[PDB]
CSV table of C-alpha atoms in Angstrom, one decimal:
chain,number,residue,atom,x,y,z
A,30,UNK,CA,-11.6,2.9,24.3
A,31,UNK,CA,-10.5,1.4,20.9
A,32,UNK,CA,-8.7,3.7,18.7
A,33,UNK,CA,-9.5,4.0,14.4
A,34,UNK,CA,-6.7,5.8,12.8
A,35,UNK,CA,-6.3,6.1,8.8
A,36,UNK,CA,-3.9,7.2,6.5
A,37,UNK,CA,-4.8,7.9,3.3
A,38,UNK,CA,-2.6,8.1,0.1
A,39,UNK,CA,-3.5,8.6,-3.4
A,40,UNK,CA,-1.1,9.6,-6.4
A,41,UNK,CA,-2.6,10.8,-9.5
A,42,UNK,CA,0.7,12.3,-10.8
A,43,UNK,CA,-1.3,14.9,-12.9
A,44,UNK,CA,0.1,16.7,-15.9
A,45,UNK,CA,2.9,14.5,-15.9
A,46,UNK,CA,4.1,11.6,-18.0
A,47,UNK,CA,3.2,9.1,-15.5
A,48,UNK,CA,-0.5,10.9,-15.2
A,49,UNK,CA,-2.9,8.5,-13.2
A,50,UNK,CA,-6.8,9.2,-13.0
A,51,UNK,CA,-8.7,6.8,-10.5
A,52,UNK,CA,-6.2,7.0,-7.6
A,53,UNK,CA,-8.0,10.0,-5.9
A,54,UNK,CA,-11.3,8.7,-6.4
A,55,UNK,CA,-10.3,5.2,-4.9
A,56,UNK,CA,-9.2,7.7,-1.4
A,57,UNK,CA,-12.4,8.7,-1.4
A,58,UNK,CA,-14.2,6.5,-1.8
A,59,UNK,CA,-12.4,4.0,0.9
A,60,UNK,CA,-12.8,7.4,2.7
A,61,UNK,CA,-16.7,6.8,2.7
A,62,UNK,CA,-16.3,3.5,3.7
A,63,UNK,CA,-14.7,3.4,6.8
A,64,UNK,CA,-16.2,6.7,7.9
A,65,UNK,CA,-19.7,5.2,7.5
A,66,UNK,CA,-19.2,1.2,7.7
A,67,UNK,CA,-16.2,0.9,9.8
A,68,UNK,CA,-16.8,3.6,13.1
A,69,UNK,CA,-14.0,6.0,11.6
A,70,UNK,CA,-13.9,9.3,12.9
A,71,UNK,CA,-13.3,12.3,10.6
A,72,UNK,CA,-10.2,13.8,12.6
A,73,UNK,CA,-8.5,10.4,13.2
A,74,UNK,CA,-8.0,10.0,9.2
A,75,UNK,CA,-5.0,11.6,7.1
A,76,UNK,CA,-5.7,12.1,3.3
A,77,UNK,CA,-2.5,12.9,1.3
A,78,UNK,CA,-3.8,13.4,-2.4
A,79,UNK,CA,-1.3,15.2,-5.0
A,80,UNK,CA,-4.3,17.0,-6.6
A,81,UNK,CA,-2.8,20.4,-7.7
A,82,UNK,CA,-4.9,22.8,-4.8
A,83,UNK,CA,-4.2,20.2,-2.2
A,84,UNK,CA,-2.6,21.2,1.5
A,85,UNK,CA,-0.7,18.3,2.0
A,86,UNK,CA,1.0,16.2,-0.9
A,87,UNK,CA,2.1,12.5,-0.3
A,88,UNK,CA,6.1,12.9,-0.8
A,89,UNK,CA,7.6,10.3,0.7
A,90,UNK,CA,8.7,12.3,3.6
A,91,UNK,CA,5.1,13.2,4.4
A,92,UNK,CA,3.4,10.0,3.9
A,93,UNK,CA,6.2,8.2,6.2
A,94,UNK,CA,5.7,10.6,9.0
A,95,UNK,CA,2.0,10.3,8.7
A,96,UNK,CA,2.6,5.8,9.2
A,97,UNK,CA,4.9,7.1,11.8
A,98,UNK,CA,2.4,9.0,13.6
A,99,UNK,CA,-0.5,5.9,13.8
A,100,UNK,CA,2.1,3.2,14.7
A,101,UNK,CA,3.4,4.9,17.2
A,102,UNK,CA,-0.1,5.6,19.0
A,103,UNK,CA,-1.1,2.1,18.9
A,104,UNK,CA,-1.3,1.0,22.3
A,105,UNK,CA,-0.2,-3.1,23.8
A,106,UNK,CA,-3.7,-5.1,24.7
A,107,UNK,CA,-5.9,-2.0,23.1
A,108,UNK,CA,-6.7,-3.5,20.4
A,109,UNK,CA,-6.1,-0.4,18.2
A,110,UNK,CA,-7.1,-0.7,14.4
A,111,UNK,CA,-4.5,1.3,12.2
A,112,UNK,CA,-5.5,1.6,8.3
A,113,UNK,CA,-3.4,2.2,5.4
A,114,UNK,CA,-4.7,3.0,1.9
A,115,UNK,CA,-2.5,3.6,-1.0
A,116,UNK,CA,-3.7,4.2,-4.7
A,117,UNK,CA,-0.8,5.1,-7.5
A,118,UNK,CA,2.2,3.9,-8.9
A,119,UNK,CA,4.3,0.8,-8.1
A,120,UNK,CA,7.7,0.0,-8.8
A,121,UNK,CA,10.4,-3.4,-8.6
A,122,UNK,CA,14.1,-2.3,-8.0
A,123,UNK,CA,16.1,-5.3,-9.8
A,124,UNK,CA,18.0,-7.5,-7.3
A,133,UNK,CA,13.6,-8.5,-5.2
A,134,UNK,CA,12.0,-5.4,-3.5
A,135,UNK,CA,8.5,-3.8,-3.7
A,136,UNK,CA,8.4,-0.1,-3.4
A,137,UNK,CA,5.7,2.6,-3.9
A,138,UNK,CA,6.0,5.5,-5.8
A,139,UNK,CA,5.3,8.9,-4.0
A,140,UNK,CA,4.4,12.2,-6.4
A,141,UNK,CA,8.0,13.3,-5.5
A,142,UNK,CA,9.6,9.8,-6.3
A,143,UNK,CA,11.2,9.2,-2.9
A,144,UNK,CA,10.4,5.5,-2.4
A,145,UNK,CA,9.6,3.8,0.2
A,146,UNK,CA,10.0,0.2,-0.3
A,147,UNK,CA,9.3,-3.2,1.7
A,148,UNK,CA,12.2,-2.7,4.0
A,149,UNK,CA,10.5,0.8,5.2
A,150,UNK,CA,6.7,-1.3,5.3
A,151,UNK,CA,8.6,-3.7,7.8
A,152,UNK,CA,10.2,-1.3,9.7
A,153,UNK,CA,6.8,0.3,10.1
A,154,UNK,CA,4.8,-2.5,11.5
A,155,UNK,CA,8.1,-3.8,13.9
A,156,UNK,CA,6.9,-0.9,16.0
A,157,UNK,CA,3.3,-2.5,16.7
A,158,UNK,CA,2.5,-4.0,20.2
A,159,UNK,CA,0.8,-7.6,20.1
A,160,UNK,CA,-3.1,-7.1,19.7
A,161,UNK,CA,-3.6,-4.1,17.6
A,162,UNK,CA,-3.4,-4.5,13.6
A,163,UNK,CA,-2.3,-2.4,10.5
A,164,UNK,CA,-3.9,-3.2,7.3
A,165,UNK,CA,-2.6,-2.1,4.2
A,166,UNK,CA,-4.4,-1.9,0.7
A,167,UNK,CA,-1.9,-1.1,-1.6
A,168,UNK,CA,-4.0,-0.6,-5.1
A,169,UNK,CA,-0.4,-0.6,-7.2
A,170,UNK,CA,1.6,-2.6,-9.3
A,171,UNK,CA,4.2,-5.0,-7.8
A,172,UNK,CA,2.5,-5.1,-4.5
A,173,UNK,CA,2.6,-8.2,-3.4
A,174,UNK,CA,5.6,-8.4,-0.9
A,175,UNK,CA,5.7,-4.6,0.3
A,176,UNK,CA,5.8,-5.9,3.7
A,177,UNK,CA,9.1,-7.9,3.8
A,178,UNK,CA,8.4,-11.5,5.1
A,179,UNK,CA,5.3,-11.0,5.9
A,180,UNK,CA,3.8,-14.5,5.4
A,181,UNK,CA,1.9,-15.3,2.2
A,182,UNK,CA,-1.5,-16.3,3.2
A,183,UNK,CA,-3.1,-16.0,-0.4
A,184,UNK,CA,-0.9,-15.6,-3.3
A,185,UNK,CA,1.2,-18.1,-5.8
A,186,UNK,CA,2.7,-19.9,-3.2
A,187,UNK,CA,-0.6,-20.9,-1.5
A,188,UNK,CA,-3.4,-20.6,-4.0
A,196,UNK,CA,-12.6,-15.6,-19.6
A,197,UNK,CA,-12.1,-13.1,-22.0
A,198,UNK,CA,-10.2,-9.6,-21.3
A,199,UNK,CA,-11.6,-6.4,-20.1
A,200,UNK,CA,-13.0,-4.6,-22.4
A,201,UNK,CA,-12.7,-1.5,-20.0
A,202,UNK,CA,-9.9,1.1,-21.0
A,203,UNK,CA,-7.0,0.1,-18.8
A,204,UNK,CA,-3.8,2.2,-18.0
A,205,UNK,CA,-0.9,0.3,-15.7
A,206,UNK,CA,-0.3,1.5,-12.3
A,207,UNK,CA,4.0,0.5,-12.9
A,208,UNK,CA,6.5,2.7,-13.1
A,209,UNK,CA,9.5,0.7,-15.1
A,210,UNK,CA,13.0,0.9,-12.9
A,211,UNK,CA,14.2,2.5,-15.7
A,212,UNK,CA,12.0,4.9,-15.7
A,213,UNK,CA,12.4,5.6,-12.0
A,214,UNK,CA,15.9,6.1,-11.8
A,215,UNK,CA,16.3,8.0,-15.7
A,216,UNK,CA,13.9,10.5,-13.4
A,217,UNK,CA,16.4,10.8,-10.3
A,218,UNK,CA,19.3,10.6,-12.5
A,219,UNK,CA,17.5,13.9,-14.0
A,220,UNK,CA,17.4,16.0,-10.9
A,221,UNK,CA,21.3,15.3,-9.3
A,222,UNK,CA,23.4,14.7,-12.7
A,223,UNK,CA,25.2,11.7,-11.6
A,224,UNK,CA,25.4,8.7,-14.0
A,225,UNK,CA,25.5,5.8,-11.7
A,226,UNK,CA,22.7,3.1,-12.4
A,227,UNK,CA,22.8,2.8,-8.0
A,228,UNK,CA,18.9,4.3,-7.2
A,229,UNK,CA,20.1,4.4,-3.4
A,230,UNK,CA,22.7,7.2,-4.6
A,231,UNK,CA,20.3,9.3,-6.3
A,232,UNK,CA,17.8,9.2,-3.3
A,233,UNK,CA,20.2,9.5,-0.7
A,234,UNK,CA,21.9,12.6,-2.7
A,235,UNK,CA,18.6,13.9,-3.2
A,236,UNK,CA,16.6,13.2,0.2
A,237,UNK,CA,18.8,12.9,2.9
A,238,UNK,CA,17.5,11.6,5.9
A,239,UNK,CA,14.4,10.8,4.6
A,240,UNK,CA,15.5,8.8,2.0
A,241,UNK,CA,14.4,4.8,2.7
A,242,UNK,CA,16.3,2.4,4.8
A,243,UNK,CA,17.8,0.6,1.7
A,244,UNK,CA,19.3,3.3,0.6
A,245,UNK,CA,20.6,5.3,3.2
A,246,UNK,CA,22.0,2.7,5.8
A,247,UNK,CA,25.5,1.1,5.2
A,248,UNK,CA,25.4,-2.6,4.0
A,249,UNK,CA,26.5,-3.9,7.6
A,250,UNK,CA,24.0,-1.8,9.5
A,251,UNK,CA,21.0,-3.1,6.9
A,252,UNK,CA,21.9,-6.5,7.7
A,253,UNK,CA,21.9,-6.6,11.7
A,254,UNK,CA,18.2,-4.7,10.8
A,255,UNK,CA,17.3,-7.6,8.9
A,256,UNK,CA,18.1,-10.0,11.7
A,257,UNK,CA,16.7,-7.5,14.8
A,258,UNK,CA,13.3,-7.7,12.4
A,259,UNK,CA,13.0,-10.8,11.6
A,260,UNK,CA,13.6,-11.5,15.3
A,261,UNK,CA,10.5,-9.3,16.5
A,262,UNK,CA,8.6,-11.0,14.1
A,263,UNK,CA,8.7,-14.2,15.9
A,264,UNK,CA,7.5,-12.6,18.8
A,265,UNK,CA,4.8,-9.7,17.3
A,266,UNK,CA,2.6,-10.2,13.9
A,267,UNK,CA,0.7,-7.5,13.6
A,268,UNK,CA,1.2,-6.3,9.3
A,269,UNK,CA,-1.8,-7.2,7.5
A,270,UNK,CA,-1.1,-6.4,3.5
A,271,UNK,CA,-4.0,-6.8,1.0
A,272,UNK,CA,-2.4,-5.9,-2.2
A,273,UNK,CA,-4.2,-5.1,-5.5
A,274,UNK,CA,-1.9,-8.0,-7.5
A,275,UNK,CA,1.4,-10.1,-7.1
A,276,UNK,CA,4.9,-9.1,-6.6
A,277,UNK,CA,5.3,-9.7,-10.7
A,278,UNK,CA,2.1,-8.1,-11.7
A,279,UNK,CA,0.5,-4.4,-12.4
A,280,UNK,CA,-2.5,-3.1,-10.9
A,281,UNK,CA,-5.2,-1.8,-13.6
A,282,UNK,CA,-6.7,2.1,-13.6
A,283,UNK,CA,-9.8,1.9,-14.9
A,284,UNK,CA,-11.3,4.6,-17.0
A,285,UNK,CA,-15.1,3.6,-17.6
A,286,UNK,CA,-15.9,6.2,-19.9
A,287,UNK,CA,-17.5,9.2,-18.2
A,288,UNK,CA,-14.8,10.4,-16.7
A,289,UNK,CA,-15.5,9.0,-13.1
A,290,UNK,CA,-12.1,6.6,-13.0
A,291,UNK,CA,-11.1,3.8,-9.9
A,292,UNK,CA,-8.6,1.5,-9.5
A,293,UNK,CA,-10.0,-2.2,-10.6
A,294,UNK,CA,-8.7,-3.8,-7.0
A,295,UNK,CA,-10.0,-0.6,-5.1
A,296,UNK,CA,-13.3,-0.8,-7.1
A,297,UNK,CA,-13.5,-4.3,-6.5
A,298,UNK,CA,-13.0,-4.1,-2.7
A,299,UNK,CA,-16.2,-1.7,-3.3
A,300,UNK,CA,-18.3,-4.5,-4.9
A,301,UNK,CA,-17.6,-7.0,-2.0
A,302,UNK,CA,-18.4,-4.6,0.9
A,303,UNK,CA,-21.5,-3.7,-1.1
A,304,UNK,CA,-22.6,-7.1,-1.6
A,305,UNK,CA,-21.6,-8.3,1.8
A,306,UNK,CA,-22.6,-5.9,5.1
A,307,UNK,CA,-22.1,-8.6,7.8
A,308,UNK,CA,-18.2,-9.0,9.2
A,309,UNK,CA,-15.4,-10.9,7.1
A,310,UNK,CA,-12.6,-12.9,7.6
A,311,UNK,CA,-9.9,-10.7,5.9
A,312,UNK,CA,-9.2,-13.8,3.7
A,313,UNK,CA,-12.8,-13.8,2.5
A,314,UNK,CA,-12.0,-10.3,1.8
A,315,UNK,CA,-9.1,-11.1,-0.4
A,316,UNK,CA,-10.5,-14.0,-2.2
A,317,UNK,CA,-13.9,-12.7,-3.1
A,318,UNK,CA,-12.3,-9.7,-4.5
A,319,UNK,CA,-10.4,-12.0,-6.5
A,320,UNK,CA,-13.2,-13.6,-7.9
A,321,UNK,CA,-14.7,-10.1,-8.9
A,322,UNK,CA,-11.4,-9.2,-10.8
A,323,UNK,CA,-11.3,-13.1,-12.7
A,324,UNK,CA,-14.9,-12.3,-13.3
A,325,UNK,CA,-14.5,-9.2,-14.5
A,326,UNK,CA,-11.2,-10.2,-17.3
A,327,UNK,CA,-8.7,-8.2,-15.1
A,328,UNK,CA,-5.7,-10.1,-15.0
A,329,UNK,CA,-4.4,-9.1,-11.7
A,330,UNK,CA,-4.9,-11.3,-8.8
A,331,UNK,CA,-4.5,-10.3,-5.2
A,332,UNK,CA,-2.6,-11.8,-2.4
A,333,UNK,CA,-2.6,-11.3,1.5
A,334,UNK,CA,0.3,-11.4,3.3
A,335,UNK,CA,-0.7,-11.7,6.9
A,336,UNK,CA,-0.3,-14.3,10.5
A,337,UNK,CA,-2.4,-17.4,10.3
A,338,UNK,CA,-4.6,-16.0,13.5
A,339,UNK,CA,-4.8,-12.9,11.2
A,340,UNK,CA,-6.0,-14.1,8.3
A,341,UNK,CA,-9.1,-15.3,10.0
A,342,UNK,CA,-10.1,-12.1,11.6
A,343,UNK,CA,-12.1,-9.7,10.8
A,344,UNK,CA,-11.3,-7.2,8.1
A,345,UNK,CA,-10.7,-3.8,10.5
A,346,UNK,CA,-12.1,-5.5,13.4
A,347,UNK,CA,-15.9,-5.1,12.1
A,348,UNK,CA,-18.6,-5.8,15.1
């Protein structure tokens, strides 16, 4: 008895300044997939979508709880398959990290991604499409399978960037607790508390020995798979085709393979087909996957 456990995340940010419109769609549509392709049951998945009538909104604090939850059911020698989409902004703090943005702006960066998959025993697996900018690297050292380090006119589609500038980020913060230090981790910490990120709520001495007692367990357990929609210098494209039916271009693209491909596949055929979908297409966005060797050629979520 294998389990299939989801979480779900999409960030539209509507009537807002940093309005998305594809993120949502890209939820459910992954949503379809894995319920119908991939043996997912409808009470083992989470959806956290910031549409205004929705129950549950992905804050930070909720969408951390919800990884907490999954990880922490994965079982040693089970096998367990743990999936994690996220569709919305992404963000780069300068001097670097990855982070997401959740609709409150409590971010959880690669540190928090890291400290998410330390908890998995040997055998089970937790992939992670993150359809946002900068999303190469949110799981910290995670090794580089496809990406820069190991690897056609434009678009015409109407394109909108799925990056929040840091600027942007912390004028926002700054906003809501009136102090005027350029520090992020002050404005989060003051603002979330305990549920603020690792970074930004542990002393510098305590973040380092976490470092170390991470990097340690990774020698030992590999179990992070990250599929991200472009680098870790790059934004991730929402695509607006014209109707009013919007989609992320990585998420889309995902789509495209699976539809064009039913039989199992290596999770780096996964990657680099949907990179030859975005080059194809004129997106300029390429995706990596950050993953173990022995990972890298298994199956994307354990298929039959």
């Amino acid at each position: 008895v294998k389990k299939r456990l989801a979480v779900l995340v999409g960030c539209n940010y509507p009537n807002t300044r940093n309005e998305l419109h594809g993120c949502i769609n890209d939820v459910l549509a992954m949503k379809e997939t894995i319920l119908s392709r991939f043996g997912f049951k409808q009470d083992d998945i989470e959806v956290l979508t910031d549409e205004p009538e929705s129950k549950v909104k992905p804050t930070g604090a909720n969408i951390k709880a919800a990884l907490r939850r999954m990880v922490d059911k994965a079982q040693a020698g089970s096998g367990d398959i743990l999936f994690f989409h996220y569709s919305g902004h992404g963000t780069r703090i300068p001097s670097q990290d990855e982070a997401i943005v959740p609709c409150d702006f409590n971010l959880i960066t690669d540190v928090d991604f890291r400290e998410l998959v330390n908890q998995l025993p040997k055998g089970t697996s937790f992939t992670m499409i993150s359809d946002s900018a900068h999303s190469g690297g949110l799981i910290d050292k995670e090794k580089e399978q496809i990406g820069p380090s190991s690897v056609i006119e434009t678009t015409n589609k109407t394109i909108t960037s799925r990056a929040l500038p840091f600027k942007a980020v912390l004028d926002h913060l700054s906003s809501l607790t009136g102090i005027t230090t350029s520090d992020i981790g002050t404005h989060l910490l003051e603002l979330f508390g305990r549920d603020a990120g690792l970074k930004f709520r542990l002393p510098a001495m305590d973040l380092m020995d976490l470092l170390e007692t991470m990097t340690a367990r990774e020698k030992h357990v590999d179990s992070g798979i990250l599929m991200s929609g472009c680098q870790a210098d790059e934004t991730s494209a929402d695509v607006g085709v014209g109707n009013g039916k919007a989609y992320g271009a990585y998420s889309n693209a995902i789509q495209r393979v699976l539809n064009e491909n039913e039989g199992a596949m290596k999770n780096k055929q996964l990657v680099m087909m949907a990179r030859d979908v975005l080059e194809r297409l004129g997106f300029h966005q390429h995706p990596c996957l950050y993953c173990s060797d022995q990972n890298a050629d298994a199956t994307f979520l354990s298929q039959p």
